[PDB]
Design a protein around this ligand. Sequence first.
Ligand SMILES: [Zn+2]
Ligand SMILES: [Zn+2]
Lengths: 251, 254
Amino acid sequence: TEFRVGALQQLLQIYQLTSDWQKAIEVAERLVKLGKDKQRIEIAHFYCELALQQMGNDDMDRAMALLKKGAAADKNSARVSIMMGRVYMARGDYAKAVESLQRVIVQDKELVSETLEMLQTCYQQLGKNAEWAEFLRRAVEENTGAGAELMLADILEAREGSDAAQVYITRQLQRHPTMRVFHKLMDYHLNEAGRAKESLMVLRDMVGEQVRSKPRYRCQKCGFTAYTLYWHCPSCRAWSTIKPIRGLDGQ
Amino acid sequence: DETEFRVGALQQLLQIYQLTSDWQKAIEVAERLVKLGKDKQRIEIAHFYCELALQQMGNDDMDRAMALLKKGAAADKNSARVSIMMGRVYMARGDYAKAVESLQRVIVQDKELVSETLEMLQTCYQQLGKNAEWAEFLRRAVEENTGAGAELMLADILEAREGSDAAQVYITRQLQRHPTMRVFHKLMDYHLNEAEGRAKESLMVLRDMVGEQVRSKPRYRCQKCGFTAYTLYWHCPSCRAWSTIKPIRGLDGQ
Ligand SMILES: [Zn+2]
Ligand SMILES: [Zn+2]
């Protein structure tokens, strides 16, 4: 309908700036039927933002209703799976929280790293700590990143000591080299007491400065970078474009 | 119009000829588009010549290749690839004086490719006995942030005069001013050199792991499509662009 699509697109952008998510859905729904299948992705995020402000009213069940509408809009949205997970955890339904959250593996494998702080407090309190270490082991070799590698490395330093963990990360750091796991060299720093002990911790600190100063996430549209995760990019105003930085300088 | 139709047909011939490595036929079509007003083709014309000069360099015909390179220089005054290939031609003919001249034109044509000229220039300056001027060129190159290759080159030269310690404090300075895994790797070698006692074994295994990443990581990336490569490809196998592959800058690279 020519100029009418332009007016909707503007209205759609302005309604997100004014954090008017319900109005943003109305405009986005019209664009979906006008041929803009890409706004399907953004409608699910709008239900996620609506649900977020329903959680601030404690109406956790109305929030869960918004998330199911969001899942209806985007089956592949990993954000709805994470938020439905937080709900099932709030209710103590730790089994259903693992059934979602693990949906992220099929939805966006670059975001499985985000479901690991939860799913840990889910396997714990479900009584399945051994099944958890198997999940991490199957996640590290599936290449989830330095996050899963170090969560697994912690479990072993407590089950089998500081010596069997040093030999573990050495093998994994070959298979998947990353500067963060190399920093875990403290394992060598637990020994060695001469002139080189005073030569090795200076090398570690150099690595340590880079581990904390280097950003953790980058937008795939523009170059935006941050230490935490954003669903909406504060530079190009896109959705689902910020993923963890994969590489030596990252995870 | 009738001219816009003919332009579109030349572009189709130029595409088919690039794709078949028919550089001679590609130059003919490209020269026609230049006549019509598409001057940006002169960039593709110089690469077409450099592909031909690469054919003649494979038959030890340095005079035929240098003739083609002069034609490429005439099409593209700014092609840094021409300057480098004329360095290889002068150097095989023993003309090390002229080799420095064309290789150094890269500083103007494409500052991101100067690191690709350092090893031949180091060879040109030792053959002329101008090893002291090479050091001055390198200090200027390190300060203009040419890369870890220049930083490491200057660090061997700084050892050939004042040894360790003196070269180390320079590297630790450059490492802080410009962190790279590669320079970090060299800093590790300075810390075990003249420093055995079961901690060297701890450091030596860490230095190997770093060096294992230095020898095996790709150093080049296409700026247009992000394709990475171990060699400097002038024609990007992925997106087929010309002179988009540059050395990877950063921690992962120079
Ligand atoms: Zn962005
Ligand atoms: Zn490319």
